[PDB]
Amino acid sequence: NCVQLNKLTIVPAGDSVAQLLVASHSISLIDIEEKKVVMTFPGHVSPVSTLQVITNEFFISGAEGDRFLNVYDIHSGMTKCVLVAESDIKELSHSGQADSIAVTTEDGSLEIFVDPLVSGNKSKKSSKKIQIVSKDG
Amino acid sequence: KSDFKFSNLLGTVYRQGNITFSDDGKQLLSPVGNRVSVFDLINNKSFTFEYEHRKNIAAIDLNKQGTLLISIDEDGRAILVNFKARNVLHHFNFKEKCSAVKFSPDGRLFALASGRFLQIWKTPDVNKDRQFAPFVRHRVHAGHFQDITSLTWSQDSRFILTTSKDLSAKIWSVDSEEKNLAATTFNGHRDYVMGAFFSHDQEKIYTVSKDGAVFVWEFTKRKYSWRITKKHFFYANQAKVKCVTFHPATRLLAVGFTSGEFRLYDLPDFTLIQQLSMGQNPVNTVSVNQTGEWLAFGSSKLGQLLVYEWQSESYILKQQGHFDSTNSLAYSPDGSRVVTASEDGKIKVWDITSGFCLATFEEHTSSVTAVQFAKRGQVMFSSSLDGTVRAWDLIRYRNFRTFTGTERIQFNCLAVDPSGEVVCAGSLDNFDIHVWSVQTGQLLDALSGHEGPVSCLSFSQENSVLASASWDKTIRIWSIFGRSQQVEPIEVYSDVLALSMRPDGKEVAVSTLKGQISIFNIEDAKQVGNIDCRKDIISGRFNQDRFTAKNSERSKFFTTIHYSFDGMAIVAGGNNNSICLYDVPNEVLLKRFIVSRNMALNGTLEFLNSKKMTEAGSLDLIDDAGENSDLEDRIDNSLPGSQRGGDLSTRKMRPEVRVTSVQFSPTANAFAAASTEGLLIYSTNDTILFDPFDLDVTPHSTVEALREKQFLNALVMAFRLNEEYLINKVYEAIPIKEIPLVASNIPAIYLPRILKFIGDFAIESQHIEFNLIWIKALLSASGGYINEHKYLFSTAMRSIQRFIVRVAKEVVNTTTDNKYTYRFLVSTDGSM
Amino acid sequence: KNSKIFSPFRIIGNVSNGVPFATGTLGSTFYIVTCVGKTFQIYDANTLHLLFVSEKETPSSIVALSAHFHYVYAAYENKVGIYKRGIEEHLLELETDANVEHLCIFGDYLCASTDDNSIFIYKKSDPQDKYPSEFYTKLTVTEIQGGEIVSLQHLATYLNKLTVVTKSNVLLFNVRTGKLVFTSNEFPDQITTAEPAPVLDIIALGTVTGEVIMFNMRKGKRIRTIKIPQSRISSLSFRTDGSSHLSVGTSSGDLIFYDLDRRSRIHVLKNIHRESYGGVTQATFLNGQPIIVTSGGDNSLKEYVFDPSLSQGSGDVVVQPPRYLRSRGGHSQPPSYIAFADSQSHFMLSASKDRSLWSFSLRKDAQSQEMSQRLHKKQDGGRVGGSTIKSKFPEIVALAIENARIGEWENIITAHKDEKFARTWDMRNKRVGRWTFDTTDDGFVKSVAMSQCGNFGFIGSSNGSITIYNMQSGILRKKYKLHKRAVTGISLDGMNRKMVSCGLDGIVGFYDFNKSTLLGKLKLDAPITAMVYHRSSDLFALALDDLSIVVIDAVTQRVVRQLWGHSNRITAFDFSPEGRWIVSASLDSTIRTWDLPTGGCIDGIIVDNVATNVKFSPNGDLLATTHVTGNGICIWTNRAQFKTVSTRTIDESEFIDFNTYTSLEQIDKELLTLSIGPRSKMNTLLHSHFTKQLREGSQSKDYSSLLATLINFSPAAVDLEIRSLNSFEPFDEIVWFIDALTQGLKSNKNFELYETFMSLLFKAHGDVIHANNKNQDIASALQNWEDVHKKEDRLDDLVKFCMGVAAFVTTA
């Protein structure tokens, strides 16, 4: 019941590297030992681009060509919150302990996201936008 | 203001197919050309369903309880209709031509007479949701040799017998384990067995054939089975049966003969009650109730319906419409009146809700062409090709004075001043605008200046100057007052017809031969702006057309134009399938309307199906009238090139889809157009679609829905019970957060009941705010239903505004009194 | 998960999925039974008209399909359906928890294999009976006997002998007994496909190598072999028409045709089905006819024929290659964007990542036709820009269609992937029309809509420019510049007067269309992802990044409603036919339904799949969802047009005997109530242990004890009760009793009575407070009186409103 799978990240559970995250528009945390899909969160409509685990509870799912990051709660099985870039999310990196997230945008933009799991508040806009532009313009 | 939906079709009271009453004798089901009309006899109202069929209807029934309506075409299109809800549930296609659908008296399963096949299907469930394939064929009985023409159940569901044009009349059961109980056939007649029946006791069998014969079959001895105990012949000499019914609980035969005669009998006795000459024209369908005290005939030679009592010599309705001959249509200033003229001469007077010709005037001898109302809808006139304009009033319903010319000349169109002296008529022959006084029958003025016919005329509602349309492509505006007798031409460049003025009378809509409607100034001479119709008109290609509709010049103009009651919209209609709603100042059409979607109507289809285009000829243009079983239907009287002539059969063609007359209602912006099919009504009276709620109940069911949080449905289950303890339970049970959510979703059926419950209970109640939110939410919810029917809520609303002023506004006046004393005593000062 | 407003009707737009379909005969003629997930379909073969569908969605996906004459046997997870006419007549639930792999029908038996390498046997209850219902036994295949069960077939003239083939070898059983009557030796290759033969004793096997083996059982010998270079075989079939011909279907999409007498291939069909979706999934010659029905995993089902042979003298040598016959196709990929095409709910446009349109017909499943992508010969004369290897148009993100002037010019505008323009199509000609419509500021088309007069197509760039092209000559009219971000949804009003646009800047711009002026500019908070307009009622809705749909009035030039309530990116959303509702679906796997006059989510459907596109029909009947998996279009019946349902705000919580009833005193504390009993007490009053209890309520600063006997005090005694108030300097009992009244209005019950007591204070001590006006002790308590008092103008706002509406509604 995963016929298309193009993104993968394994969890930092310790020495136990079981229950990793596979995704293509739909994500499954799946055990290595019991060979079963354990948790199934709906991903995005597009094929997924970025699949990053931040913390022990939260991981970012990213869509290709879409402007919406989704921060999913691991054990709760729901979205903790959403981030939304100014344009299509082209690349993703995150800090050590869910402090601030770097979004490389497809238009050419850098959106930073500051305390993404802080306290409606569920729609999280871009905090800072770091563009780069030449001397002449 | 834009959204107009189909409300009701009027007239053309029978074309083809079976007629039936409901469970109650109120509801009568008749086919129209492709639709089903329902006429409620005691509660005198009429109705026609929102949908149409694709060909002419040849089979019809409704449910036992009145829940499902089956209409079946000539071809075998079957349409499942929520009869109580007026919405279509399923389009099934039976691939054979069927003649009889009859539900069970159980209501559990219906059956169908298609070919030599009987098909017995389970009923689909109404309270269940609509499925892809709801229909389940229970059984199929094919023991017959020719086409099965008639069919009945027993009064028990467990016995069904059908009869064919083959000699046989055969009984079976629903269930095969009840096969061995009775499964046999009847024979021994002479001819088409046209109706075979069970008696009310399930022991006597009546079998009636085309030749004029009945056998009384009975399971009797010389094991032993099923002899004829007697025969019965009415001895119709050359006349033969067309249609036959049998009401069993009073043992009554209704017969329909080819000579238009009809007989009644008492079947263990076979005694002639009475013979009625229904006319020259044969009874094409008979019908009885379960009470069996009304009879229903339809002559498809004329197109008439007739409900008449057998016991008392008394009709209920003798309705006789005229196809292709709906020439004029007229809204009164009152929105309760409608006038239809004809080529036969009959000018009928309709109510919009209760669709009945309340009046008629059968005093014109020829075609009546144009009808306008004047002076608050009192007087109503009728110009004709009968050579006259005959006046009519709506109180005495009489002719006032037949205004005549000199040389007895036909009159094309009619225009009436609101100041009720001036009536102008334009002629198709004489092309001189004759002005008649209403008080004096002399002509006031013979306005001359039309080279070729005067098409159409209208006065302003404001300056009452008239605008006539030549066929010399030229408007002539006449200002006949102030003792000038002055004229002005407006040159158009192409051939105008169907003139129509704004109510302001400073702008005019014109339809040229190009289809282009132009708007003309009247205070000035130039053209204001022109809206195009040759692009956005649905036209049809006939089966005998030899050119495609994209470059057909058949119907891409407009035979009637009307301004809206702001003057800001226009509905136009022509010889096409398309009715159009242009905005006046924005100059672009809002919505395009089909009048009718019928294959037997000629110019309906845009693209013809190439499987019917054979080697030489159409597949339908072959004369198929020569294969009828009946001599009269095999007789061809069609004169070759008759276009919109006298009768239907004499075109030697299909009827063209054409719409003659177009008008707006003043009030609710509803527009009615008299089509080829008849008068159609579009309106903005939305949610008059009747909607039954929560159809099968305990008090526990509503209270469990309170526990189930199904609070609007619990209010319905309470209001079907009508015990005020339950209404005060369910009333104070819902929270405030879904009060206007509930009240907007309340039907109009319990609307006087809920308004009276609020209007009575809130007078003695401490929950003044809570009751007030209900009246706020209801009056903001469905105040429009109280806008139309004011006398329906007049007892409830009286109690409501008793509670508002004496009970609530007294508390409010106490509040504002203490408030204003506070404002005074804290805003002012003291002394010493 | 259940919806109240809508319900599933069918998934429109599916032909097959790849599960090996079955063939059956009625008399002389043929039907075809294919699978679509949890729902199977039946076809005539001579027209590919749809005959039946499943009466129910199965709870899990169908794994196997067999078909005898009137009875089609479906096989999902543990249970096997015996269906007559697509209706569940008998469910046969197998006595394992193993999943049903394969199935076969012969004799009085049914035989179905599971993935525990064990086959179950189901006898008829009698040979007089027609469908098998008696459970006979379970036999198994242990790993000395065979491998994983690839198929069960019954070769003819084999009395109760069951032929179970594995990846390894072939077994034969007496299923009356249960005894293995023969085991074949292993074939050294991995056997992948079985097929019986119109010759005796022969089973054809296509392995994981390109090898087909004809195998006897009376010999037990592999009589002939057939090679294929480097292709994995999927299906085998035999043309039983009159020349011995063999069908080899790869999983590479290719169909290979052999004549075993000439020992030669006849023609190999290439790419009749998509390789990535399973290749050729199942191809089968119709028995005794020169017609082979092929089925792919690309939602497609084709027919091919051998033409009769041109060689009069030879016949069998000269063979016409197979030739395309009728086919029902679907979207191979799931559909990206759908819309309702016509006004009468007949046609739906569906575009996918398969890079094609499809014009489905919800009336009849066979009028569903794929649109053409064939360019008109360019009206300029200089030749067009594209690869000569003509690829399909890139997948579509937006759709736009008005049927006002259909077939006189183009009326379908489609915003393809990453193209600076957007092509136009005739809906009537089922073909892309002559004009393509650019952005003219070198950005991508990200949203389009057309004019209701059929003369204008509106095209919104990623850099903000909105071009108005004409559908007459492909000419532009005006190029509006308002947004500097991307446009993301455009519309025109129904009169073609005032046009709106929503952008990725957070701007909704109000322009006139006849005129050329920017009328209004509403600034919303998040950037605005989409725009849906309701022409009949002149509203327009928008999804934004604030997870919430704002419905904006175009007349009053402001928000009328905002529905907060979703949890994720709102994918698609749609008005009702009449503007009463909006159906929304988001990435939260919710499809919520909204009553916009109030603004509450009156039902939300929880789905297993994420709903990508929702589309309310222009008729009041149908709702179309497309999911992220699944290629069809789920059609939903709208029950509101049939009876009704409840409308509650019940979503976030998931996501009698005596026939009498005493009244509730106070429903919620916020509402105001009166005194139980007579209402006439106000008319009376307006026309010591007491002061001790008032003190003992004052020392609490809660006076709830006083109000009880204050209601219950006789009305003439109050004319001395307030006329003895003991206040000359301290004004305590004045302020004690006034704060008693203001605490009385706090619980809102007996609301009128504390006003009557206030006016009775004015009858008693208005001078005692008035000559000592400005005194900050009583002025504080009367300020407290006003603060408690100022809420209850909401019934004066109710009484005056409701009164005027009542008069205005009765008179007019």
Swiss-Prot record, chain A:
GO terms for biological process: maturation of SSU-rRNA; maturation of SSU-rRNA from tricistronic rRNA transcript (SSU-rRNA, 5.8S rRNA, LSU-rRNA); positive regulation of transcription by RNA polymerase I. GO terms for cellular component: nucleolus; nucleoplasm; rDNA heterochromatin; small-subunit processome; t-UTP complex. It is found in: Nucleus, Nucleolus. The keyword Transcription applies. WD repeats lie at residues 43-82, 84-119. Keywords: Nucleus, Repeat, Ribonucleoprotein, Ribosome biogenesis, rRNA processing, Transcription, WD repeat. It comes from the Eukaryota. Signal peptide: none annotated. Present with 33100 molecules/cell in log phase SD medium. Belongs to the UTP5 family. Interacts with snoRNA U3. Interacts with MPP10. Component of the ribosomal small subunit (SSU) processome composed of at least 40 protein subunits and snoRNA U3. In the absence of snoRNA3, forms a complex with other t-UTPs. This complex can associate with pre-18S ribosomal RNAs. Involved in nucleolar processing of pre-18S ribosomal RNA. Required for optimal pre-ribosomal RNA transcription by RNA polymerase I together with a subset of U3 proteins required for transcription (t-UTPs). This is U3 small nucleolar RNA-associated protein 5. It comes from Saccharomyces cerevisiae (strain ATCC 204508 / S288c) (Baker's yeast). The gene is UTP5. The chain holds residues 144 to 286 of 643 of the full protein.
Swiss-Prot record, chain B:
Belongs to the WD repeat PWP2 family. One of its GO terms (molecular function) is mRNA binding. The modification Phosphoserine is found at residues 629, 642. This is Periodic tryptophan protein 2. The keyword Iron-sulfur does not apply. WD repeats lie at residues 11-51, 52-92, 93-131, 143-182, 188-222, 236-275, 278-318, 321-360, 363-402, 406-448, 449-488, 491-530, 553-592, 654-692. GO terms for cellular component: 90S preribosome; cytoplasm; nucleolus; nucleoplasm; Pwp2p-containing subcomplex of 90S preribosome; small-subunit processome. Its main location: nucleus. Required for bud-site selection and cell separation. Also involved in nucleolar processing of pre-18S ribosomal RNA. Interacts with snoRNA U3. Interacts with MPP10. Component of the ribosomal small subunit (SSU) processome composed of at least 40 protein subunits and snoRNA U3. Residues 631-652 are annotated as: Disordered. Keywords: Nucleus, Phosphoprotein, Repeat, Ribonucleoprotein, Ribosome biogenesis, rRNA processing, WD repeat. It comes from the Eukaryota. Present with 16700 molecules/cell in log phase SD medium. It is found in: Nucleus, Nucleolus. GO terms for biological process: endonucleolytic cleavage in 5'-ETS of tricistronic rRNA transcript (SSU-rRNA, 5.8S rRNA, LSU-rRNA); endonucleolytic cleavage in ITS1 to separate SSU-rRNA from 5.8S rRNA and LSU-rRNA from tricistronic rRNA transcript (SSU-rRNA, 5.8S rRNA, LSU-rRNA); endonucleolytic cleavage to generate mature 5'-end of SSU-rRNA from (SSU-rRNA, 5.8S rRNA, LSU-rRNA); establishment of cell polarity; maturation of SSU-rRNA; maturation of SSU-rRNA from tricistronic rRNA transcript (SSU-rRNA, 5.8S rRNA, LSU-rRNA); ribosomal small subunit assembly; septum digestion after cytokinesis. The gene is PWP2. Pfam families: ANAPC4_WD40, Utp12, WD40. CDD domains: WD40 (cd00200). InterPro entries: Apc4-like_WD40_dom, G-protein_beta_WD-40_rep, PWP2, Quinoprotein_ADH-like_sf, SSU_processome_Utp12, WD40/YVTN_repeat-like_dom_sf, WD40_repeat_CS, WD40_repeat_dom_sf.
UniProtKB/Swiss-Prot annotation, chain C:
Its main location: nucleus. It is found in: Nucleus, Nucleolus. WD repeats lie at residues 22-53, 63-93, 101-140, 150-183, 190-227, 234-269, 277-329, 336-370, 397-436, 445-479, 487-523, 528-563, 565-606, 608-646. Pfam families: Beta-prop_WDR36-Utp21_1st (PF25171), Beta-prop_WDR36-Utp21_2nd (PF25168), Utp21 (PF04192). Involved in nucleolar processing of pre-18S ribosomal RNA and ribosome assembly. Interacts with snoRNA U3. Interacts with MPP10. Interacts (via WD repeats) with UTP18. Component of the ribosomal small subunit (SSU) processome composed of at least 40 protein subunits and snoRNA U3. Present with 2020 molecules/cell in log phase SD medium. The WD repeats are grouped into two tandem seven-bladed beta-propeller regions. GO terms for biological process: maturation of SSU-rRNA; rRNA processing. InterPro entries: Quinoprotein_ADH-like_sf (IPR011047), SSU_processome_Utp21 (IPR007319), WD40/YVTN_repeat-like_dom_sf (IPR015943), WD40_repeat_CS (IPR019775), WD40_repeat_dom_sf (IPR036322), WD40_rpt (IPR001680). SMART domains: WD40 (SM00320). It comes from the Eukaryota. Keywords: Acetylation, Nucleus, Phosphoprotein, Repeat, Ribonucleoprotein, Ribosome biogenesis, rRNA processing, WD repeat. PROSITE patterns: WD_REPEATS_1, WD_REPEATS_2, WD_REPEATS_REGION. One of its GO terms (cellular component) is nucleoplasm. This is U3 small nucleolar RNA-associated protein 21.
